[PDB]
Ligand binder design. Structure first.
Ligand SMILES: [Mg+2]
Ligand SMILES: [Mg+2]
Ligand SMILES: [Mg+2]
Ligand SMILES: [Mg+2]
Ligand SMILES: [Mg+2]
Ligand SMILES: [Mg+2]
Ligand SMILES: [Zn+2]
Lengths: 37, 217, 95, 69, 69, 115, 107, 129
RNA sequence: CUCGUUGGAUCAGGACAUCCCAAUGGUGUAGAAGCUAUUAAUGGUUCGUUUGCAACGAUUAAAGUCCUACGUGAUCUG
């Protein structure tokens, strides 16, 4: 959950979500790819 | 009639009912454990149970240097020197872990306090641990030992030469020059001994207490 | 007779106050005006204790080492001492 | 003599009136159940209480001297 | 030097007998402890030192072997 | 009340501290949340240009009732590992150290007397 | 460094320094002090040398000494002056010329 | 039950090299029994000490409070203090240096205490002529 | 071809860009030490030695970074 200006997918399995007013990419395979805006 | 000092109430605005309750509890304990008569300067042996140990008691022998407290809070301090090490323990009369109190030698000293023994030579406070009790005569006046101790170098824990202490059991002449003694008198405060409103008269109270104390028997 | 002195937890101590530290800055600032640098140290302690700051900080300018207080020191083998100083590179030394 | 023995120090000078009340701390929330619910009425004479009521840990006077066996 | 050489022999022998009568502490160690101490101390002594060292057995043996059980 | 700078008496038999010479050892640090150190409290002691941990076994300050008040501040030298430096302690040591939180059994074994 | 006086003697302490002089002088074998200070033929105990030299200088002081029965101020020989006075003589050359680093010449 | 006989028997099971058992007269306000044991290695002390404490917790002591393990900071002396019994465990080198057995066996004649003498009362050093 | 207010004592107010306490993500997170990140301003945030501030010694759960005209001289002081 690194907070970055730009959210970019790091893998094919990565998907995008809009939770609690911010954009999140969560990857089932790798928790490392989890991010927040 | 020797009335234990704690029984006499101190003056104030406290109601007598507080003292009456405390006396009743105190008298009950005296039945279980007898508190022998003793005065400051008498050598005492006290047996007390040690909470740290398991079913084991301990004894300490020393000369009673101070009596303080009122009611169930009454305490006494007895002092002795062991292996060249001076030790003082403050003992509570009615503590439930005291098994016995023994008056090895019943005697009175010239002073009401023996705190100055800290500045006296070691011999004047050393007492044999296993010293056997001496015979005592009830139908007599308590012996008054008039020994005047010898002090160690001048720097003392307190200024015993000063008039406020009113010590009458120290050999000042050997330790202090006459000029010093005159200097101490600058703090004499002679007026105090002659103000009639500083006197606490317990004649009626002592008579009243004795009847009730004897009544419980 | 006797035995080697044991440390037994002894600690090295120093006072090194501000003026000692502040003085060092002036040495750096005033280095330009100095044509050459003379190192003065006690003869009785030729090299056991020395301040390395001088050589590194003042190494730019030429440095010559002089051991003063020679009278209060024993110099039975002074020649050997010079060799050790020469070994370090400080060949030019006057007592 | 209607005397209650309360641990530690109580505010006020000696002979000062106080307001004793059941404790409000969370641990003491339901300690009133065992005690008389409205109050105790001696006139009722349901039971004759002893003069002095003690707690189990308290060492009553006239008991044998405490031994730490 | 000692109170009597007969007592020394008797005393030292007495300690060995006492060791044979023991319950908890190691039999072998007690024998070694007495032997080593007796071999060293009693070899060289003076009138005062020997009397004191001989006092060990009298007090030690007569005090449950120093409390050994 | 043993604090910083207090001159203390090393009631022990250690050659380093028990020998009667040099100024009385002075307390440098008290291992308590408060500065004041009482019986059973460790303290750091400076002896002969060395820093040695010690243990308080008695002090001159009045204590709770039924407790021994000594006429001098007594302390015992303890190694870093906890083993006491001295092999014997002949002066009486208070027995309260047994139930105080900490490791004191080693000192009690060394101390023959008990008050 | 303390022996030659480069660092203030306060923080190090003359007493501790005084011992180092005895060890070094004894190890070197330059027993100049015995002649200057008439104490004995030779000694290697710091306590012993300090005791006698104070008598030679007639230096004494009153020092508090902790004892079991209290704190008593009892007069004592002035050890501190012996350390200070002894130290001064060494740097004034009375004891004799020394080489503190004599061990390092072999290297 | 946890007692001296069981404790020493357990010690023999773990095979402590040296075992000493000392009964303490009631006069001293201390433990009823004093025990000393030796150990081959530092690990041996840790193993045996832990084993004895584990047995104590299992073997009753439900009402009795638990016992701390002391000396783990050091590598050569571990002492455990039960309410009525105290066991001090040390390596052979530590045992001989301290000489615990002589202290408790000889209460006031032990050589180490004999060597120490009561310090003379400080007397002022007076310079004369 | 030289240079232009401020320590300390007393009492502290607030900011969070968190030093410690607390709640969590990720980890090149086995357990144990950590490292990286987010949320949170709740209370706390040491004693000395050298002494002109810079070092140092012992500790602590931590010995935070800053603003309040050196925060504060009609409260005191270098
Ligand atoms: Mg009063
Ligand atoms: Mg005083
Ligand atoms: Mg504030
Ligand atoms: Mg934040
Ligand atoms: Mg200061
Ligand atoms: Mg103003
Ligand atoms: Zn992914």
């Amino acid at each position: 959950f690194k907070t970055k200006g730009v959210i970019k997918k790091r893998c094919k399995d990565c998907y995008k979500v809009k939770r609690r007013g911010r954009w999140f990419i969560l990857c089932k395979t790798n928790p490392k790819h989890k991010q927040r805006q | 009639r020797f009335l234990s000092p704690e029984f006499i109430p101190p003056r104030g605005r406290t109601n007598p009912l507080k003292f009456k309750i405390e006396r009743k509890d105190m008298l009950d304990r005296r039945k279980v454990l007898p508190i022998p008569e003793f005065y400051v300067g008498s050598i005492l042996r006290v047996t007390t149970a040690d909470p740290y140990a398991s079913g084991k008691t301990s004894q300490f022998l020393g000369i009673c240097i101070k009596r303080s407290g009122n009611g169930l809070g009454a305490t006494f301090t007895l002092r002795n020197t062991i292996e060249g090490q001076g030790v003082e323990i403050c003992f509570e009369l009615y503590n439930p872990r005291i098994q016995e109190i023994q008056v090895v030698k019943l005697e009175k000293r010239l002073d009401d306090n023996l705190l100055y023994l800290r500045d006296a030579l070691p011999e004047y406070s050393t007492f044999d641990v296993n010293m056997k009790p001496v015979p005592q005569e009830a139908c007599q006046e308590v012996p008054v030992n008039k020994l005047k101790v010898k002090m160690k170098p001048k720097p003392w824990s307190k200024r015993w030469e000063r008039p406020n202490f009113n010590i009458k059991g120290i050999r000042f002449d050997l330790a202090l020059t006459e000029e010093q003694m005159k200097e101490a008198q600058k703090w004499n405060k002679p007026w105090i001994e002659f103000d009639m409103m500083r006197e606490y008269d317990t004649s009626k109270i002592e008579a009243a207490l004795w009847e009730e104390i004897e009544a419980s028997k | 007779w006797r035995e080697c002195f044991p440390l037994q937890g002894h600690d090295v101590a120093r006072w090194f106050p501000g003026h000692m530290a502040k003085g060092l800055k002036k040495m750096q600032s005033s280095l330009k005006s100095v044509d050459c640098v003379i190192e003065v140290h006690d003869a009785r302690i030729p090299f056991s204790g020395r301040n390395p700051l001088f050589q590194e900080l003042l190494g730019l300018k030429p440095h010559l080492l002089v051991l003063n207080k020679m009278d209060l020191a024993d110099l039975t083998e002074q020649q050997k001492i010079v060799q050790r100083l020469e070994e370090k590179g400080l060949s030019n030394v006057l007592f | 003599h209607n005397i209650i023995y309360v641990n530690g120090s109580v505010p006020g000078h000696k002979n000062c009136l106080v307001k004793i009340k059941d404790s409000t701390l969370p641990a003491y929330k339901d300690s009133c159940k065992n005690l008389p619910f409205p109050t105790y009425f001696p006139d009722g004479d349901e039971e004759e209480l002893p003069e002095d009521l003690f707690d189990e840990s308290v060492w009553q006077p006239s008991e044998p001297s405490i031994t730490f066996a | 030097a000692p109170w009597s050489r007969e007592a020394v022999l008797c005393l030292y022998r007495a300690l060995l007998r006492q060791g044979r009568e023991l319950r908890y502490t190691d039999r072998d160690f007690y024998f070694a402890s007495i032997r080593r101490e007796f071999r060293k101390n009693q070899k060289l002594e003076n009138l005062e030192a020997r009397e004191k060292q001989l006092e060990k057995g009298l007090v030690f043996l007569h005090s449950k072997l120093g409390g050994l059980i | 009340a043993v604090q910083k700078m207090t001159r203390v008496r090393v009631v022990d038999n250690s050659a380093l501290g028990s020998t009667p010479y040099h100024r009385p050892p002075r307390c440098i640090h008290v291992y308590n949340k408060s500065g004041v150190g009482k019986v059973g409290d460790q303290i750091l002691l400076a002896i002969r240009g060395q820093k040695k941990k010690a243990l308080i076994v008695g002090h001159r300050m009045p204590g709770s009732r039924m407790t021994p008040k000594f006429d001098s501040n007594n302390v015992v030298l303890i190694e870093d590992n906890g083993n006491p430096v001295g092999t014997r302690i002949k002066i009486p040591i208070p027995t309260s150290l047994r139930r105080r939180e900490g490791e004191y059994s080693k000192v009690l074994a060394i101390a023959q007397n008990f008050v | 460094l303390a022996l030659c006086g480069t660092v203030l003697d306060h923080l190090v302490g003359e007493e501790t320094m005084a011992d180092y002089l005895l060890y070094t002088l004894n190890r070197h074998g330059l027993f100049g002090y015995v002649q200057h200070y008439a104490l004995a033929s030779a000694c290697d105990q710091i306590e012993w040398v300090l005791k006698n030299v104070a008598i030679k200088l007639r230096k004494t002081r009153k020092v508090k000494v902790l004892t079991g029965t209290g704190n008593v101020n009892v007069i004592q020989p002035d050890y501190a002056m012996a350390a200070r006075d002894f130290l001064r003589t060494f740097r004034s050359g009375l004891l004799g010329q020394v080489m503190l680093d004599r061990d390092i010449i072999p290297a | 039950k946890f007692d001296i006989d069981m404790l020493v028997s357990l010690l023999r099971q773990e095979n402590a090299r040296d075992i000493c058992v000392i009964q303490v007269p009631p006069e001293m306000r201390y433990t009823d029994y004093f025990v000393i044991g030796s150990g081959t290695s530092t690990r041996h002390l840790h193993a045996m000490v832990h084993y004895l404490v584990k047995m104590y917790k299992h073997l009753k002591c439900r009402s009795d409070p638990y016992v701390k393990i002391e000396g783990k900071d050091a590598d050569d002396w571990l002492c455990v203090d039960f309410g009525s019994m105290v066991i001090h465990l040390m390596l052979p080198e530590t045992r001989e240096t301290y000489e615990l057995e002589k202290l408790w066996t000889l209460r006031s004649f032990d050589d180490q205490l004999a060597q120490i003498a009561a310090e003379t009362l400080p007397e002022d050093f007076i310079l004369g002529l």
